[PDB]
Design a protein around this ligand. Structure first.
Ligand SMILES: [Mg+2]
Ligand SMILES: [Mg+2]
Ligand SMILES: [Mg+2]
Lengths: 244, 239, 239
């Protein structure tokens, strides 16, 4: 018998799913956080553990939904160079043994522009542009890579993207601090993957974050950046504490 | 430590879980128990102060756990809004908003409260749902500062707890129902035309109480609890 | 895809779900893993910085996942407070607060930490619960800038993880218990008089660490985790 408001019973698939996406408050061994970008975004600097960071007067457009993409944050450049939006978390809490997995549902802009730089992975925070590691998107080209002190230390082959298209990217932290990134179509079909040779860019302080960052490299406004529907964080953690 | 049945309280907990990743439905609620200095949102819901509105100390009262009293400032059109964006709630979503609220000790012609859609912040040009002007609750639609539809009025009791349910219909018409704190229907209104809707940040749907005048000290409508319940089509590929 | 049993893992997650819409219970916890810039609340809990207090980088240590270290500024009475309003925990709620915290590498007479009720922010006039001054923990009450009641002191060790449980009694008295990181009880105090209570925004209940002097660079007490559990009167009419 199925559980009721007055009498106990079994748990439905819908209740199981709900529980699977519950944001961690007090941790034991698993960490989960996700945000679906449905909230009014004026002055919104975090949600469900995730930092939502605007710099350089980046233009967060009106929230919309399209098709199955519920809550979408479109992003437009400003007159300040390096303006960015970052949805991410601190690296200090996800050491290599946590095997953090980050999943991002994102839409390419309606026109590519050489000024567009997006990363799914680790990155310098804010207006910074010197360090990143994961799936990098410059203009219409996606590729796995590492950038350190503004130098490309490692670069995979490129996958050319289409404008106004929904994509999924999974970033996977490996136990030696290397990473694997996988790009999928909106139906989950694998399109591209890259596994790093060297360890990811890491800073275990607030100069860096891990997640999604989209940025305009020039000081011209009105350039569309990458829109975000959904981000998910999952990791294994050590959080066994004495109960009193 | 052993897998078993799900408790009725556990299922009740899950039933009011604030949506993180949407699949089939949306839910959000806020019970106003948090320290309110610099609090601009909770549980997906916007908590918007404008015109230097005076948010009084949080209190509880009987079974009304967590109550936000609100008082006017010296800025005309000052308001507090607890709400969400309409763009995420199209007519198919069939959105339902429930508000537990308390009328002030004294009514005032400067008080304007809306449960439904409304101009954001200092705006007064557009609203649809249950409109409270002075002591009078009525269903209605206002667009560009003019009434387009107005139901009969209901005289509310001062210092009294009410419940309002706003229902979005699948054709974007609405129905509003006012209950007493006992849960018995006191007043209802079903709209003829479609509600006021703006699918951008110039509007919100939820609860808004406002002072139309620049006189401070006027108590507006206090809020205990707001609830958002909707249907969503949000199936994305798992990877 | 098919209905069935609930796992122990699922049962555990639901047990520590942060209360949204209340019925008979309240729970909130925060584990200090978030980027702290501009962060003033999380999971119902106020996270308050005053006097330009220096929040260090979030770290984790052993099984202490998400830790917020805290350092003094040039403002006397600069503090960090993780807590909630007292109006929402009347004496009948029997609130229980649990704090996991680490002492600094060096004690200093300027260090003042409270688990329990306290003046907010730069305030230092009122507190009750487990008070830590310099290297000494003790149960006690201070009101209007004067001790009213003071338990025996217990000498803490530097760079050491501790747990404190604060328990609200039905007559508004309190019991505090101090534990080792493995959960061995080390100290307890049960008050004779009622706790410090102010049911407004001049006070909070939870954790507060403060530097009494205008000298920067003095480490205060780090916090890993805070929990709030209580009974609530929130049975209201449905629909
Ligand atoms: Mg979304
Ligand atoms: Mg309430
Ligand atoms: Mg922690």
């Amino acid at each position: 018998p199925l559980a009721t408001e007055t009498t106990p019973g079994l748990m439905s698939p819908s209740e199981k799913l709900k529980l699977s996406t519950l944001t961690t408050s007090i941790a034991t061994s698993d960490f989960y956080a996700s945000y679906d970008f449905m909230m009014h975004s004026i002055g919104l600097t975090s949600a469900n553990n995730i930092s939502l960071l605007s710099t350089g007067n980046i233009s967060l457009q009106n929230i919309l939904s399209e098709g199955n993409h519920f809550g979408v944050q479109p992003i437009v450049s400003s007159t300040t160079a390096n303006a960015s939006f970052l949805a991410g978390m601190l690296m200090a809490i996800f050491p290599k043994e946590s095997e953090l997995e980050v999943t991002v549902y994102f839409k390419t802009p309606s026109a590519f522009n050489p000024a567009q730089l997006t990363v799914i992975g680790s990155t310098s925070i804010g207006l910074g542009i010197s360090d990143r590691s994961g799936l990098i998107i410059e203009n219409g080209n996606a590729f796995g890579g590492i950038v350190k002190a503004s130098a490309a230390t490692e670069t995979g082959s490129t996958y050319a993207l289409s404008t106004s298209t929904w994509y999924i990217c999974k970033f996977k932290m490996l136990t030696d601090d290397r990473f694997k990134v996988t790009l999928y179509s909106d139906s989950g079909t694998q399109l591209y993957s890259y596994t790093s040779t060297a360890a990811m860019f890491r800073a275990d302080n607030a100069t860096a974050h891990i997640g999604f960052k989209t940025q305009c490299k020039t000081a011209t406004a009105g350039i569309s950046l990458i829109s975000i529907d959904l981000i998910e964080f999952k990791a294994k953690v050590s959080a066994t504490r004495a109960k009193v």
